[PDB]
């Protein structure tokens with residue numbers, strides 16, 4: 083299901099609150115009703131002199147499999163957003179497959195504070211949208227998002243009641259992969 087094109091980042095957001103620690107997805111919204119598998123995800127995003135690089139993990143809770151990626155792209159000047167190319171790696175961060183140059187994801191930060199964040203991700207394989215997802219993020223696994231971030235969900239035109247909560251899925255994480 084094609085990504086929403088009604089996305090732009092929150093202006094004036096504090097990038098130091100976003101590029102910090104690791105994030106766990108506590109709640110995700112993929113509106114596509116053809117989806118069946120539910121995921122857990124965690125990642126650790128960094129930024130140095132305009133270049134964003136992040137280590138990313140997905141766990142397919144239905145199939146009990148996982149995959150790892152490294153994303154890299156430029157920080158937009160117009161707001162807290164980046165379009166990254168991604169490599170596939172193993173749990174030891176060894177490269178399995180270099181980036182396919184036709185593929186990218188755009189991550190747009192909608193809110194970020196010291197405990198929590200809200201972001202939108204659209205993954206593209208050339209001219210095909212793989213899909214988009216909104217993710218509520220916290221620094222501690224199974225934590226509660228802040229009131230500020232909950233407000234951002236509503237103000238994005240969304241309803242938290244429709245998100246899938248990950249705390250009850252039986253997630254397996256790889257905390258070593260996302261550690262400082």
Ligand code: HEM
Pocket residue numbers: 107110112120121122123125138140151168169170187189203205212215217
């Ligand atoms: C719980 C939240 C998330 C869910 C439900 C989700 C879901 C998915 C799904 C279903 C796929 C396709 C898997 C496949 O068929 O191979 C995928 C791939 C991908 N996702 Fe996510 N995702 C989540 C969070 C994220 C986050 C936070 C990021 C970036 C920071 C991200 C970036 C990507 C990328 C780059 C791919 C392509 C990976 C590859 O082909 O190697 N996703 N995701």
